[model samples]
Target: QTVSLFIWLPESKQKTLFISTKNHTQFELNNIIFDVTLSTELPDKEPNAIITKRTHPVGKMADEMRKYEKDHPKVLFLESSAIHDMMSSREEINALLIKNNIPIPNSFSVKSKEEVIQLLQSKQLILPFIVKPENAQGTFNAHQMKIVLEQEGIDDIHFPCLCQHYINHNNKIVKVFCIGNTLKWQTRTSLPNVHRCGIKSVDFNNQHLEDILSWPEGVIDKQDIIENSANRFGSKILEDPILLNLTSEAEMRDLAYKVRCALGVQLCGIDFIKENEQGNPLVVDVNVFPSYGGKVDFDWFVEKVALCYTE
Candidate 1:
């Protein structure tokens, strides 16, 4: 097969590049290149571009890559240091969104019980909010999150967490996946609205996966039960049709473009949920180089990347 995917450098300085085995196979299967691997030592002839994964070594390696970019102004290193920084910290990204006038849920980062109390006392953070871990790079304690309903629920919270006001979306979520300038979206079920009750907080650990993916039997059961009850009681007022109707493709594309510009990355994923009123989409999460797999077309993504270089 003839390969069309090529890296572009300023002044048309093109050359074979270094990439991971996993990624090399994707291009190799399509006959883009035979196989490529990162060298332990810098070569005399620098590559016009470098393909890296999220799990690849950074730190010193990242510094070296940035230095290479400085020397070769035309060479692209996939993601910049700024993108990596924003990807590791949600607070940074949230602040950027707020600064850029993007709609995001009201949120605050806290490190102690006293801080949480003070926020609540001063009305900075209202009740019926959700607690998420401060740093989400590699931590996997699903039980760390709790939806607080009352003051008591705030007592035993793990320090250094984010308290974000929950926005009710009638149990629906929108995920926008992007590759360079291309974008695609999908809908999934989210947590249902909460009512004032005696229950202090709801530990999401047990239902974490299902809540996001709506998998297996439990999530479907909850959806059917709530949606059915909602329809029967005439509370089924929703935002247009299920899929793209909930949010416009143009709006989502603009949002994706802004996000890509803000992060300075070509590949990423973002999630949104409609606010209770006005039905405006609110950004909830962001991920770096996510597993598109079943959620998107892998071939299309590869083609988009190729186009970016060609342009």
Candidate 2:
């Protein structure tokens, strides 16, 4: 299949060339790349353009793709919708996994400020918990708040959000990539705590399949493995399959994949918290519309995406 490498911008600025072997090796000395010259309206907001020092509004880029591709075949969007709601939220996801008898944090959906207040006063919610908008993209409006009465004789705060019993995992996390039932790669990180990283690549050898194969129902687990193995994140540069195989080492890739499908996400990172119960993994949040500038080499990812659609 022939694929067109569409980049929202050039490399000197995007910096993807520094990481992707395929792109860097090809364009190290070339000066012909263009970033957002094609984006007539949002020329200032190209794919590689940084929305903020800490945030990358990739959804805008996806919007650009729709204009450029216009429903063309073979064009697969790499980013998912960033909002969380009934469509994607911790409450919704927790319910699904609970229904399936899978391990997850106890969650409650609040439709009004009253319910939140009630839950807070009744001590029905757990502390050090996460309160998030149900369908926020890229973890927007997401915050970790510990429930404590701040001398007001009140414990609950009012917000239309999903509240969950917090599980302490010491900040270890895994990201499993899936493509239609194949796990393409698994990257393990101790982010903002242990290692400072934007995006990294790693490979999983063949020794840890059994653990990854053990989550969810047998049927669901099987499908998760297949979908996760086919998708790869990071720039085609510095992309290592080693991160992909961390699932094999930790044995929870299946759960991550299930959370992805459960949240109605096509491409995303499933954040899992290590459960105290038998050291199982639980879904904490789904970061659809996550920042590509951090985990994805935008230049290389865009190039691969462009080529993928062109073919």
Candidate 3:
């Protein structure tokens, strides 16, 4: 039997590692050897699994897959539609999060700057709220965010973005990463206080993720921010008692699983922050297929993904 893993991009250098490692290890099922390859073409074998990061304009991707699914009934195709609706865009997921009682700050999506202004002019959002790109169908630059301290700070904000109230977590960012149904969390340095930020509003990218932020100044306090930038926000894992202890909570695990079920995608990350040590963690953001960055072995990841289809 042969199984295919389909994606739009060429086997990326890292993803190539996932496939190349398959060469050294093989999986057998019901006396049949399953040959796995990275491809877009449908496998003729029954009970095949095809996972794809399909192209833009999401509904089209689902339609494309519908044709393939009907022609090949046994193939289990993981559509990007659910992911796009629930994670790629902001508005739908925000509603879904609230419906499921998932912890998230109150957020609203706006397509135009006028809409943004309207929201700000009214009480729709308070000052010091953070804004980010609403679409991540393609990933990354979309993660870039700006923390607005004043209503005027929103003037330079990019259109078609989400306005989310920023919860102060005391410079601690907890990244809860999920694969299948389980999660692993770590504490990383987060953006400093809006007051300490020195500027009225700071335009920054990479909020405590592997990628690597600004303020005008009466006093230039480089201590807190320089530490984050020097390490690219998520570079080093911290040794903290509270975050480490909190990660082991049953609620945290349950919340991670609920998010996976709600988002309908395996391999994701939840960016949440805790206020002081008393409040429930607020899920600031959720993303699909985050850079686990060696936290989860790539070979093991491929094995886990492949077994689901073959089993």
Candidate 4:
């Protein structure tokens, strides 16, 4: 008899299959009848109805839940405050990571547009920095710049605006999929020898994943080593399967769960960058109600998500 309940997806989507009994039982309407309460409210419930909190604090709503409980889960909180914003500035998510002692990038939140210009003026900031709108998602408003210092009579184009410091992932990044603490799957992508250039797009089709299997043991291992180096670098993936698998998968699971905990998110995606060094998993960004694989590959995306709530 769990009482805490938070749901993601458009309000339009909620009108269908699920219903909350407000404190009794919860499951698919056709599956089981249950009561559900917000994680904040669950703490006040009676013993049998009481449960721990399972939400993270990446947005305003998540912060509210975190203020409620710092530890535990109460039947999985499902709050998606920024459902439409997938690629907003990493500041908010960065704050959460700092609070939790999680590793992340060196980011600055500039309120004045001028501050953005000033940072760009300073050549110390690395080229190919990531620029993003504070409250937008899907990489629609997000842009990464690979700064090139022009010389030999070449002119340098200026991109002076409110922006985040770009992080160069040594050209390798990994997508670690997690449900609670299970590293269900791992995806590695990057264009070889392409400095400061991000992949044009990712096609996460079933066949594509199958292709990973076709990769040479050396190639796969190489990527795994990169990922492992990234893990130490704060969210980077490794190129060695042995080292990658050595991670107990719980790293992603714990990270995913912690993300939920910090933001009251029931399910989401945690994008990480494998650093240039030992591949520490650096928290680059977190998604609330992570995109359901549609943009890349929704079929498997939905399957993994559906599996999260599975018994």
Candidate 1's error at 297, in angstroms?
5.7
- Report the C-alpha lDDT of model 1 over 199-299, residue by residue, as the tens digit: 67766552243442322233224555555553432222234334446778777888888877766678778878886534667888877655542433434
In candidate 1, the residue pairs with backbone N, CA or C atoms under 3 Å apart (3 or more residues apart, or in different chains) clash, namely none
Of candidates 4 and 3, the better by lDDT: 3
Q: What's model 4's TM-score? A: 0.48
Model 2 gets an lDDT of 0.41
Identify the leading candidate in terms of lDDT.
3
**TM agreement with the true structure for every prediction:** 0.70, 0.49, 0.76, 0.48
Q: Score residue 130 of candidate 1 by CA lDDT.
A: 87
- Clashing residue pair totals per candidate (backbone < 3 A): 0, 49, 1, 72
In the range 155-253, model 4's lDDT, one tens digit per residue, is 222233224344555544445544443344444543222232233211112212332333223322355546444333233234642354423365666
Task: Report the error of model 1 at residue 87, Å.
Answer: 1.5
**Poorest stretch of ten by lDDT in candidate 4:** 149-158
Give model 1's TM-score versus the native structure.
0.70
The list of candidate 1 runs beyond 4 A from truth reads 1-46, 56-75, 142-144, 206-244, 293-299
Question: Which regions of candidate 3 fall more than 4 Å away from where they truly are?
Answer: 1-9, 13-20, 23-25, 28-47, 54-73, 196-198, 207-214, 218-222, 232-235, 240-243, 295-299, 306-311
Off by over 4 Å in 4: 1-77, 82-89, 111-113, 120-124, 142-162, 178-183, 190-248, 291-311
Per-model CA lDDT versus the true structure: 0.61, 0.41, 0.64, 0.42
Q: What is the lDDT of residue 259 in candidate 3?
A: 85
Better of 1 and 2 by lDDT: 1
Instruction: Output the better candidate (1/4) by lDDT.
Output: 1
